[PDB]
């Protein structure tokens, strides 16, 4: 069956579930579909704060039912990232988080791409594969961030005025976020700019690997 989840922001997420699904699983699906950690999610049905250990049938949540999502500012575990400027960044994390996930959080908070990040804990550079628990990264433990001026993959974008500009990207980057990078570097708002590659319009949902755009590939920007 399918259910709906309404947020204060107006969005109504549609989920595919079973009556035997726990609230925890539902929050996991909300995570997979919205990128929000389960411990930062608060689900409301029939005036009750749903408990993760209970199932949807325990709250008589029928088909086409509507839950309410309230978001929390913090989860149950925070870590601290220390940069060389002094400002101690605080990250909401779960022990299941990989280092790539942590770098993704650092990206969402500071704008710096994961492949330009260099995390060191206890004198050891953290590998993107292992999780936080792997390095015994406990609550409130402090990592150290080392910055990189360039990533691993660069693409160039030509404006209609002959001016080309470099861009640090990843194969997973959607065209929307590429438009966001163009928005940061050049200034052109995402809704005015149209991206063209291989003689076709680039859609904001497709990743860079979807058009298999490799490194050092030139994209043509119009408006």
């Amino acid at each position: 069956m399918q259910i709906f989840v309404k947020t204060l922001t107006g969005k109504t997420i549609t989920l595919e579930v079973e009556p035997s699904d726990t609230i925890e699983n539902v929050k996991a699906k909300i995570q997979d579909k919205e990128g929000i950690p389960p411990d930062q999610q608060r689900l409301i049905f029939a005036g009750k704060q749903l408990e993760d250990g209970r199932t949807l049938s325990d709250y008589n949540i029928q088909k086409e039912s509507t839950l309410h999502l309230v978001l929390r500012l913090r989860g149950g575990m925070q870590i601290f990232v220390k940069t060389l400027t002094g400002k101690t960044i605080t990250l909401e994390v779960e022990p299941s988080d990989t280092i790539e996930n942590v770098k993704a959080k650092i990206q969402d908070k500071e704008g710096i791409p994961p492949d330009q990040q260099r995390l060191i804990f206890a004198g050891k550079q953290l590998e993107d594969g292992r999780t936080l628990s792997d390095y015994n990264i406990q609550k409130e433990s402090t990592l150290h961030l080392v910055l990189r001026l360039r990533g691993g993959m660069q693409i160039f974008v030509k404006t209609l005025t002959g001016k080309t500009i470099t861009l640090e990207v990843e194969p997973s980057d959607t065209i929307e976020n590429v438009k966001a990078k163009i928005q940061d570097k050049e200034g052109i708002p995402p809704d005015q700019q149209r991206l063209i590659f291989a003689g076709k319009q680039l859609e904001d949902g497709r990743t860079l690997s979807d058009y298999n755009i490799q490194k050092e590939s030139t994209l043509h920007l119009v408006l």
Binding site: L8, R42, I44, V70, L71, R72, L73, R74, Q78, E140
Partner: protein
């Protein structure tokens, strides 16, 4: 076929004001429900603050302990 005419007439009788009333009720209750949800949001943020204050107090306690240890180790220069 009089009942067809009566059906159309009954449907159209003050139809506009009735539909307006329905939509208006929907909007009203949407607003009230949003009120409830905003109250829940207030509760949530309040909880978050309680947690942060807790952790901050813990960190301050740790600071006190560390300052005591520092003063102790500074005493041990005699």
């Amino acid at each position: 076929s009089r009942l067809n005419r009566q059906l159309e007439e009954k449907i159209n009788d003050c139809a506009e004001v009735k539909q307006e009333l329905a939509a208006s009720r929907t909007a009203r209750d949407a607003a009230l429900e949003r009120v409830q949800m905003l109250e829940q949001q207030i509760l949530a943020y309040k909880d978050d603050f309680m947690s942060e204050r807790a952790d901050r107090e813990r960190a301050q306690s740790r600071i006190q302990e560390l300052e005591e240890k520092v003063a102790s180790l500074l005493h041990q220069v005699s």
